[PDB]
Amino acid sequence: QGMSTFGSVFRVTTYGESHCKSVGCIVDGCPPGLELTEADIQPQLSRRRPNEKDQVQIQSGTEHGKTLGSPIGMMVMNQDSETDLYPRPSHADWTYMQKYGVKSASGGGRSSARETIGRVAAGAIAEKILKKANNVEIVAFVSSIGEVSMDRNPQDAKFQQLLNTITREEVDSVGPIRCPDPEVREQMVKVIEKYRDAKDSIGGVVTCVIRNCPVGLGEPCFDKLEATLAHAMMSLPATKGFEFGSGFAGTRIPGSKHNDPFYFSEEDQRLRTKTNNSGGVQGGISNGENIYFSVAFKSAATISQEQETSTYDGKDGVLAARGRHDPSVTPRAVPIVESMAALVLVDQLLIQKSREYGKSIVA
Amino acid sequence: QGMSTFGSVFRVTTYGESHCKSVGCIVDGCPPGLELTEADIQPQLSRRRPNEKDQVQIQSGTEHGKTLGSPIGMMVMNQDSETDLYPRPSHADWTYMQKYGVKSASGGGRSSARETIGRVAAGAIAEKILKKANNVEIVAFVSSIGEVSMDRNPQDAKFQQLLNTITREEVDSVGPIRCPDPEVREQMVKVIEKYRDAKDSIGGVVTCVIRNCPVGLGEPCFDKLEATLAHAMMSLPATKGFEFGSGFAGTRIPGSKHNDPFYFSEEDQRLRTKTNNSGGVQGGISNGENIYFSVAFKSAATISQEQETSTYDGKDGVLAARGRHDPSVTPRAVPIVESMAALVLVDQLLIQKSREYGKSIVA
Amino acid sequence: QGMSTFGSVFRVTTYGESHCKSVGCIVDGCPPGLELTEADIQPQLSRRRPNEKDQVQIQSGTEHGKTLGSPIGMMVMNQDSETDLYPRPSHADWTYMQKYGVKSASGGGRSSARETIGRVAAGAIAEKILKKANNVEIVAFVSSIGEVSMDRNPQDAKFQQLLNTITREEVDSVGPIRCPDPEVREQMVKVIEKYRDAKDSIGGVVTCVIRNCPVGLGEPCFDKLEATLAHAMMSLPATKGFEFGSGFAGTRIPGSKHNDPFYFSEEDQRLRTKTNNSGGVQGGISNGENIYFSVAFKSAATISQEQETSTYDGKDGVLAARGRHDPSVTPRAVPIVESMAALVLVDQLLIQKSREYGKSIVA
Amino acid sequence: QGMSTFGSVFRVTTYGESHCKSVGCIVDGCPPGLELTEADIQPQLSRRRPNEKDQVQIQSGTEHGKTLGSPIGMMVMNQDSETDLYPRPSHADWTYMQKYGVKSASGGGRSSARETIGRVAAGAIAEKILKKANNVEIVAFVSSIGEVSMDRNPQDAKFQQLLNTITREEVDSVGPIRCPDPEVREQMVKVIEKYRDAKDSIGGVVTCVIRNCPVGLGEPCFDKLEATLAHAMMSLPATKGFEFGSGFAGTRIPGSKHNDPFYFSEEDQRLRTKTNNSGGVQGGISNGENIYFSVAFKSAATISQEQETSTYDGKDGVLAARGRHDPSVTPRAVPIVESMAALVLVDQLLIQKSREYGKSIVA
Ligand SMILES: [Cl-]
Ligand SMILES: [Cl-]
Ligand SMILES: [Cl-]
Ligand SMILES: [Cl-]
Ligand SMILES: [Cl-]
Ligand SMILES: [Cl-]
Known part of the structure; x- marks a missing residue:
């Protein structure tokens, strides 16, 4: 793992705050030939907040509804006296000013919950793979x-x-x-x-x-x-x-x-x-x-x-x-916990299956 | 992180079971010029079990009691009807036979507590650095x-x-x-x-x-x-x-x-x-x-x-x-928990100080 | 490094083909407080091909023209008898069909030159940092x-x-x-x-x-x-x-x-x-x-x-x-070579400066 | 990759200078059940310099001549007016004093050729796996x-x-x-x-x-x-x-x-x-x-x-x-080049076979 990248073989690098332009992620290492459109990804995202505002849009890695094996960019567009006088207690306002020397003007920015959109979008791809794998x-x-x-x-x-x-x-x-x-x-x-x-x-x-x-x-x-x-x-x-x-x-x-x-x-x-x-x-x-x-x-x-x-x-x-x-x-946080669990499992499954191949050739 | 490697900039790759030849680790990324001998490492290791059997021996990365900045190898030499009939309940015997197709003849091997020697040996170096850093x-x-x-x-x-x-x-x-x-x-x-x-x-x-x-x-x-x-x-x-x-x-x-x-x-x-x-x-x-x-x-x-x-x-x-x-x-497990906490902290400290430099030049 | 991610502390994960929706990258680990707008990034991108078509648009990681320290998403929108009969000689058509089982319908997709947009966009941020660092x-x-x-x-x-x-x-x-x-x-x-x-x-x-x-x-x-x-x-x-x-x-x-x-x-x-x-x-x-x-x-x-x-x-x-x-x-490829060199240098500079801090505290 | 660690799934972390105690490596991710003793590793090492001095000794990861899947430690014991007056031209003496503030008293230390022992020792395991894989x-x-x-x-x-x-x-x-x-x-x-x-x-x-x-x-x-x-x-x-x-x-x-x-x-x-x-x-x-x-x-x-x-x-x-x-x-350097090529190939083979599994389940 590294900063805003999670995973080893099935990797997801996320990005985005609330008061920026967009929020999303890049899924690297998805198996090719998987049926994947925005319909596989919206339901978990549409479970995060319960016009349809938070709608994903696949940017790459797919063609004719199937994955190519190349990175898969995905995004949700950002619709978005007391401010900066006090750091809000138990919020990340003060730690951001100490670590980065600057915070978002309001809303907490990267520390808030909007970042988890990249988690859920990537977890939807992992969930479908685990279902095909062993009906997880x-x-x-x-x-x-x-x-x-x-x-x-x-x-x-x-x-x-x-x-x-x-x-x-x-x-x-x-x-x-x-x-x-x-x-x-x-x-x-x-x-x-x-x-x-x-x-x-x-x-x-x-x-x-x-x-x-x-x-x-x-x-x-x-x-x-x-x-x-x-x-x-x-x-x-x-x-x-x-x-x-x-x-x-x-x-x-x-x-x-x-x-x-x-x-x-x-x-x-x-x-x-x-x-x-x-x-x-x-x-x-x-x-x-x-x-x-x-x-x-x-x-x-x-x-x-x-x-x-x-x-x-x-x-x-x-x-x-x-x-x-x-x-x-x-x-x-129920769908975010589910999405987070799927990302871990598909990464460990791909690593282990690589060992299962090696175990089969050295035998 | 990856398998038996922990850390990003201050990295430790461990190795060793119980019934093998030795157990230890390789600490990569230690700052040069740190006073480091086996006396900085034995006390936490000598707190793991309470002749002196489990004694570390620095293999590299030091000269005249000071670190060079190169990898630091460290080791403890391994002194070491029902077996393989049942997998011991709540032990890693069965999962090892399923994942690897083979387990150690007895003692559980890599899943046991002997692996933590590499953790404690590396954590001792991290602990001393954090003390010099901010008296952690x-x-x-x-x-x-x-x-x-x-x-x-x-x-x-x-x-x-x-x-x-x-x-x-x-x-x-x-x-x-x-x-x-x-x-x-x-x-x-x-x-x-x-x-x-x-x-x-x-x-x-x-x-x-x-x-x-x-x-x-x-x-x-x-x-x-x-x-x-x-x-x-x-x-x-x-x-x-x-x-x-x-x-x-x-x-x-x-x-x-x-x-x-x-x-x-x-x-x-x-x-x-x-x-x-x-x-x-x-x-x-x-x-x-x-x-x-x-x-x-x-x-x-x-x-x-x-x-x-x-x-x-x-x-x-x-x-x-x-x-x-x-x-x-x-x-x-008290010293292992302490050693594990020091490894995380020194890694995050080095990464953050790299950002503190970059924050100082782009300003 | 890993697949479509380059760098250790200053990391860039890229994405995008030619016949997809967009191409871009996510820059993770940029120092906060750096003056950064699309004007710092377009010149090298506008040197790749010599309406203005290939225009970047910063998606996150910035506010009021300055970086926050969070991931920085960037993108260029994709304007885009013999096909699939022969694999084009010395092209990646056949190796993609062997590795992934599928290639892009035409244009080579991820193997082509459009992927390098993420390289150049990220290299522009690295170039500006190295100029502030030591006038590189x-x-x-x-x-x-x-x-x-x-x-x-x-x-x-x-x-x-x-x-x-x-x-x-x-x-x-x-x-x-x-x-x-x-x-x-x-x-x-x-x-x-x-x-x-x-x-x-x-x-x-x-x-x-x-x-x-x-x-x-x-x-x-x-x-x-x-x-x-x-x-x-x-x-x-x-x-x-x-x-x-x-x-x-x-x-x-x-x-x-x-x-x-x-x-x-x-x-x-x-x-x-x-x-x-x-x-x-x-x-x-x-x-x-x-x-x-x-x-x-x-x-x-x-x-x-x-x-x-x-x-x-x-x-x-x-x-x-x-x-x-x-x-x-x-x-x-002249700007791509320049952008590729800047990404390496800023990564090695941040890692080394982390060691320079550690060298200063253990001394 | 990271510092003295090479590889993603088949990883090798090396250590050791010339004037230290030992030189070696830790191979992480080797497939279990591979016939592996020092006889699989000495020939390439015994080709590096042409009593038998540079002899490897497997420290872990094996039992009864077969790999377990756990890390594999390996080592060669170190038998080892003008000094520090001039930095030797075109040697790493000066750059080490600038980067680390200290060099080995003589011999160049980590920059010399003794470090490549860990490369060759690990490459011997990779070579045998690639032979079983496709007779590489x-x-x-x-x-x-x-x-x-x-x-x-x-x-x-x-x-x-x-x-x-x-x-x-x-x-x-x-x-x-x-x-x-x-x-x-x-x-x-x-x-x-x-x-x-x-x-x-x-x-x-x-x-x-x-x-x-x-x-x-x-x-x-x-x-x-x-x-x-x-x-x-x-x-x-x-x-x-x-x-x-x-x-x-x-x-x-x-x-x-x-x-x-x-x-x-x-x-x-x-x-x-x-x-x-x-x-x-x-x-x-x-x-x-x-x-x-x-x-x-x-x-x-x-x-x-x-x-x-x-x-x-x-x-x-x-x-x-x-x-x-x-x-x-x-x-x-002929055996070191061979060993270096085997490490790359076995890493890419394991990653690709993980994709071949995923390609087979999502199909
Ligand atoms: Cl990574
Ligand atoms: Cl939200
Ligand atoms: Cl790593
Ligand atoms: Cl023990
Ligand atoms: Cl182009
Ligand atoms: Cl030698």
């Missing part, structure tokens, strides 16, 4: 908003059965909260409304599952699958934590119960595991089981409220309430 | 073992004061548990003994703090500081999760309280933050505040107990108890 | 066209004095041939006309000089300055060779005469060399002397003539004369 | 020493027949000159002896051929096959130029004669080319034809003669004759 299914959903949280205990049979069956269509059918639990979601809609009248913001947690992942993906010792996934998710805006499998709470379970015993699958074709506390990754390598992980998103710093903060000139004052912002943007 | 202090400690956990609430004043003052000497003075809390540590020594007689294993959580980190470190949008740190920690053996700042529990705090207001430091030289819920990183860039994070380590799969597992031939059987293993290896 | 001057010119060649003997005093004084304005004042030698150029215009009536094509050689290059640039052992420059030039379309300094002909000179003795500069500030047979690079590191090199460009495969070739179906036939092409496109 | 044959030989040069005209039928048949065994049977031409070699042995009595040094040119290279290798637009090969060869010590195919002299041939027509092979299985002026690469992609290239090596700077040079203190003086050095070291 990547579904994310909101499992927690503030104190209201799903029962995502990895040992709970009901939660594990949800991870095995949850689809992207079901997540979006429950409304904008994108929580598949009806009881928890109703508790969620009451807490986002409470923070809405309070002119506040609240954080959340996104849980995502990867099904039918090919075995053998991951590049120890540093580019392990769960390490590249953590790298991918923790690079998202406002993310504060990442865990997979049994996660943090699994450390309380002894090895006699935490260990995943092996068994030959009931369909009788492969060795599977009885339990999936490992989260589908063992020694940094996928074993074909379900890969599930949760990502913590902090509460939005931009609150519709007054704050006592010091200026850049560093004098104590009151940052006036801007007063126009939604209190829970965590469900808007 | 990297201290890690065990904050949780199973159900026994420290009160690491990021809003707790006492815990924040511990992160501001805890030293590596104090962590090792409390014994092998490496928990600075005397009440919690005594509860820890009773739970590791309980799992010891039970012939079981238990997981834990390592908390680490970075002090005096230079402002401006981190490379958005993908190589953000907290993203490279998560990548670094989640690539370690047995790690199941990573969080920094307010982490997962911070998502329950509204923005009005979670936001970190700014203020001019009491020593009067810089703009600081009143609270540090951001964890010293904002928009993927360090702001000079304390960087604290916790890493979850699963319970060891190698238990001194019997397990019901299926063979590679995939027939149900009993994996006999090996019966010789310690039930809590989490405190052995 | 990069001038290229045509020194050979077929059998007509300049007397570019590196030991010739007149040729060395030309390399020390030749400017980009003087190269373009002599006409489209871009050969600074008036006698040789008149011999050149007579040989391109001879091959024009013959409906043929002819190759050439481009010589380029870099002046005021900062000392210390280059990353041994693989990313040496002359190695990155060779990599940069040999990646251009139709290039068949690269040499620098004394080059191939210098191998005939014994070390007693080929060696460059040192001497303290006449301006009295630095140690210089009496002769420059090394070409300004020694051990892969720039010494501040003039860096001069020549690049061989083959004769264009697309000739306005008939050729006997086998089909994809592989039957002997006659490829009809297309009859519309210029016989000498070597002078059109 | 890499043979290099000395074609020129000073003014004495072979008739390596690419259009000459006899020279092309030599490239098609020359073997590594035949090159070493003619003696240490490693020139397959008996008439030219006898003219070579007379010119190296002339410069030997003169206490001088002379340069040379190494020509290398790659046979049976798989079609489709090369990663446009920057990592084209001939670009990675030029990068690989120009990173070698003392190299001053690189050309492939028709090279520089081919620019004098019009396209009507320079173009390579296609034809279906006489063995009747594939489309081949009648002539090979392209050098087996077209558009940066291998077409399966012979890949031949020449590399220019300058005359050794270390001459057994007196030189007038300025000090580091920069006062005119006489550098005394060291008087112990061989006048023609170009034949010692």
Whole structure:
């Protein structure tokens, strides 16, 4: 990885702020002959914000709806007293002025959420490739908003059965909260409304599952699958934590119960595991089981409220309430988490298949 | 990053298993003229396991105790019925046979903990550079073992004061548990003994703090500081999760309280933050505040107990108890977490200082 | 480097064919605060082909004519019986069908010269940075066209004095041939006309000089300055060779005469060399002397003539004369060679200055 | 590429000077299950200098003579009035003091030829893989020493027949000159002896051929096959130029004669080319034809003669004759050129085969 480039063999270099001309990316290394038009890319992008404004336009790498193998440029055109007096608390205004000596006049620029358009646009190509590869299914959903949280205990049979069956269509059918639990979601809609009248913001947690992942993906010792996934998710805006499998709470379970015993699958074709506390990754390598992980998103710093903060000139004052912002943007990161997971998987799949070729010729 | 290479400008490529000849690494990009002998590298390595067996030997890149700027090779010499009948549950035996078609005859090989010698050896060079840079202090400690956990609430004043003052000497003075809390540590020594007689294993959580980190470190949008740190920690053996700042529990705090207001430091030289819920990183860039994070380590799969597992031939059987293993290896990852954090920081510091030069000439 | 990405710290990822929507690049790692508009980028682009068709449009990374430090997207909009019967001899038609299984319907696509727009657009930013850095001057010119060649003997005093004084304005004042030698150029215009009536094509050689290059640039052992420059030039379309300094002909000179003795500069500030047979690079590191090199460009495969070739179906036939092409496109590569040299230099300069910082703190 | 790391998927990170403890490398990404012991690696290393001193010792990545897929460490142990008064002319003494502020006390250190041990050790693994892949044959030989040069005209039928048949065994049977031409070699042995009595040094040119290279290798637009090969060869010590195919002299041939027509092979299985002026690469992609290239090596700077040079203190003086050095070291670079070519090819082969998998699933 390097700066605004993600991936090794399937690479995506992104660009763009909010108050510039356009935002997009360049996907390098896509396999040739893949059916690819803007219809394969808009649905995930059109899931980012729920005229059609944010519309992609493929710039290269395709001909007659099929990829050539050359870089694929994609873009969404940019429609776009207190400013620069205080750095907004818990925003990247001050760190940008320290690192770059200059920030965007407003809106935060590159640190904001508009940059993720390149992520989602590239992840749509990766998603289609993984479906052709092994029918990989990547579904994310909101499992927690503030104190209201799903029962995502990895040992709970009901939660594990949800991870095995949850689809992207079901997540979006429950409304904008994108929580598949009806009881928890109703508790969620009451807490986002409470923070809405309070002119506040609240954080959340996104849980995502990867099904039918090919075995053998991951590049120890540093580019392990769960390490590249953590790298991918923790690079998202406002993310504060990442865990997979049994996660943090699994450390309380002894090895006699935490260990995943092996068994030959009931369909009788492969060795599977009885339990999936490992989260589908063992020694940094996928074993074909379900890969599930949760990502913590902090509460939005931009609150519709007054704050006592010091200026850049560093004098104590009151940052006036801007007063126009939604209190829970965590469900808007569900497609970005899905897109980020697909980029990692297709990169590890191509690297591993290169080893599978070499393993076949030196044998 | 790529496979067994970590870093961009300060790069370390590692190698080595347990049952091979040697284990070590090659550090590429170290600044010339740094006082460097094996005495700068052994202490952290000699903290990995608590004749002197694991002794490093610098192979190149130095002359008269000073670095030349060329690659620095370093090594520790390798002193080293049921085997290959079953893949050990929750171990990397099966995934290695699927990805590579072959595993080490025993001991797990590259997936085990011996590979981390290259990490610690390289991290010792990075640690010394960061001390010369801005007197950076990297201290890690065990904050949780199973159900026994420290009160690491990021809003707790006492815990924040511990992160501001805890030293590596104090962590090792409390014994092998490496928990600075005397009440919690005594509860820890009773739970590791309980799992010891039970012939079981238990997981834990390592908390680490970075002090005096230079402002401006981190490379958005993908190589953000907290993203490279998560990548670094989640690539370690047995790690199941990573969080920094307010982490997962911070998502329950509204923005009005979670936001970190700014203020001019009491020593009067810089703009600081009143609270540090951001964890010293904002928009993927360090702001000079304390960087604290916790890493979850699963319970060891190698238990001194019997397990019901299926063979590679995939027939149900009993994996006999090996019966010789310690039930809590989490405190052995404290120096590896410290070494992993130093490698990330020195890489981001060199990249950022290259931008600081360019910022000074185009101005 | 990786596929369509060039550079380490100053990175450029390009994209685009001829028959697609647009062609351009993403420049990652540009220092913030640099005065940058399309006026800094069009002149070199407007030198590629000598309404204004090929006009760049900055997409991001700038605000109020200054760079922010974020990625900089740039683009030129694409205005754009025998086809697919034969692969055109010495073209990339057949290799594309073998590697990708598909080629562009016509025009060669990514293998053609339109891809170099991203190179030139990015090289313009690198050129301006190197001018602010140490007043670096990069001038290229045509020194050979077929059998007509300049007397570019590196030991010739007149040729060395030309390399020390030749400017980009003087190269373009002599006409489209871009050969600074008036006698040789008149011999050149007579040989391109001879091959024009013959409906043929002819190759050439481009010589380029870099002046005021900062000392210390280059990353041994693989990313040496002359190695990155060779990599940069040999990646251009139709290039068949690269040499620098004394080059191939210098191998005939014994070390007693080929060696460059040192001497303290006449301006009295630095140690210089009496002769420059090394070409300004020694051990892969720039010494501040003039860096001069020549690049061989083959004769264009697309000739306005008939050729006997086998089909994809592989039957002997006659490829009809297309009859519309210029016989000498070597002078059109002068700005691309300049742009390619600037990209290498600014990358090595930023890496080296990162080491100069580290050298200053560990001292 | 990065500093002392070469390759993308098949990566080699080298280390080591002359006056250090050891020299070697770490090969990352080797396919598992390859028969590999020191006997596969010593022959090319034992061809570098023609007790057994320079003996490799595999440190990791193998078990029972087969590779595991983990990094492979390899090493050769280091047996090792005028010094530091003058920087030796045309040596890297001065540039090292400017870039690093320090050089090795003597011998040049990392800039010398001892670093190439890691290249040859890694190239031996790549060579064996390419033989299993498509029976790739890499043979290099000395074609020129000073003014004495072979008739390596690419259009000459006899020279092309030599490239098609020359073997590594035949090159070493003619003696240490490693020139397959008996008439030219006898003219070579007379010119190296002339410069030997003169206490001088002379340069040379190494020509290398790659046979049976798989079609489709090369990663446009920057990592084209001939670009990675030029990068690989120009990173070698003392190299001053690189050309492939028709090279520089081919620019004098019009396209009507320079173009390579296609034809279906006489063995009747594939489309081949009648002539090979392209050098087996077209558009940066291998077409399966012979890949031949020449590399220019300058005359050794270390001459057994007196030189007038300025000090580091920069006062005119006489550098005394060291008087112990061989006048023609170009034949010692034949195995290094072969090893360097194998590293490039196996990297491009693995990347391309990853695309061949992706091409097979999206189809
Ligand atoms: Cl890269
Ligand atoms: Cl947006
Ligand atoms: Cl790399
Ligand atoms: Cl160990
Ligand atoms: Cl064009
Ligand atoms: Cl040697």
